[PDB]
Amino acid sequence: ETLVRPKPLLLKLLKSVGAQKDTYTMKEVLFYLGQYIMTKRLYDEKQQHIVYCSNDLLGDLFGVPSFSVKEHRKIYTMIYRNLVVVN
Amino acid sequence: ETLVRPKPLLLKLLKSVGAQKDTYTMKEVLFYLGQYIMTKRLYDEKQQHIVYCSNDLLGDLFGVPSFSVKEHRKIYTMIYRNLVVVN
Numbered sequence A, B: 001e002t003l004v005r006p007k008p009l010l011l012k013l014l015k016s017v018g019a020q021k022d023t024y025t026m027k028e029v030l031f032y033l034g035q036y037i038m039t040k041r042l043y044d045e046k047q048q049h050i051v052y053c054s055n056d057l058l059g060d061l062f063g064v065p066s067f068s069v070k071e072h073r074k075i076y077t078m079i080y081r082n083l084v085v086v087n
């Protein structure tokens, strides 16, 4: 019942998975983003809730990558990937 | 009381802000990451809790960028940056 209009880059992604409209509901945009991710297998094989933005199109939709200092898990994940134990 | 050993890339960042040890406490690594961010001004001017990973060193420490499908705010932020209203 409420339609939105994707900017060109998002429109291209939708069209890449077979959309043909110019305007979409929010549920539609979510469905097609999903489709793009599953069909290109951009999700982690082991933890499928995780999506990699290495794909240029999807990455670009995000804009400059950033994190919040409130994301403690993401920060400690980063730290521990760059540490070793002292024995 | 518990020391960890940064891998070379993290060590370089610490050394870039004046550290000289090879091993650190966790509080120390956090302090120096902080220092790097503030002194290079990688944080958003308007929302200072937000840090951009455009800086190559800091970005690389994170590895391939990813998001979780549980991050609803980050996903809708992305969607709405790529939409306009239909009038």
Ligand SMILES: C=C1C(=O)NCCN1C(=O)N1C(c2ccc(OC)cc2OC(C)C)=N[C@@H](c2ccc(Cl)cc2)[C@H]1c1ccc(Cl)cc1
Pocket (backbone or CB within 6 Å): A030, A031, A033, A034, A035, A037, A038, A043, A048, A049, A050, A051, B069, B070, B071, B072, B073, B075, B076
């Ligand atoms: C429902 C499913 C779903 O249950 N199965 C796969 C398709 N699928 C799906 O497309 N989605 C999922 C989602 C759930 C579990 C999951 O574990 C493996 C993986 C998911 O799928 C992505 C790995 C492809 N959750 C939705 C969602 C809806 C709204 C919001 Cl703000 C966030 C997420 C949607 C989706 C995913 C990513 C984006 Cl950018 C957009 C939509």
Ligand SMILES: C=C1C(=O)NCCN1C(=O)N1C(c2ccc(OC)cc2OC(C)C)=N[C@@H](c2ccc(Cl)cc2)[C@H]1c1ccc(Cl)cc1
Pocket (backbone or CB within 6 Å): A069, A070, A071, A072, A073, A075, A076, B030, B031, B033, B034, B035, B037, B038, B043, B048, B049, B050, B051
């Ligand atoms: C305390 C302060 C702090 O209060 N003031 C600035 C220095 N400062 C700081 O260095 N930090 C902050 C932090 C708080 C509010 C804030 O709003 C503007 C900005 C913050 O600072 C970054 C913008 C530079 N919170 C710590 C933290 C500690 C543990 C964890 Cl898992 C997460 C965050 C630490 C910090 C920040 C980023 C990284 Cl990668 C590592 C450490």
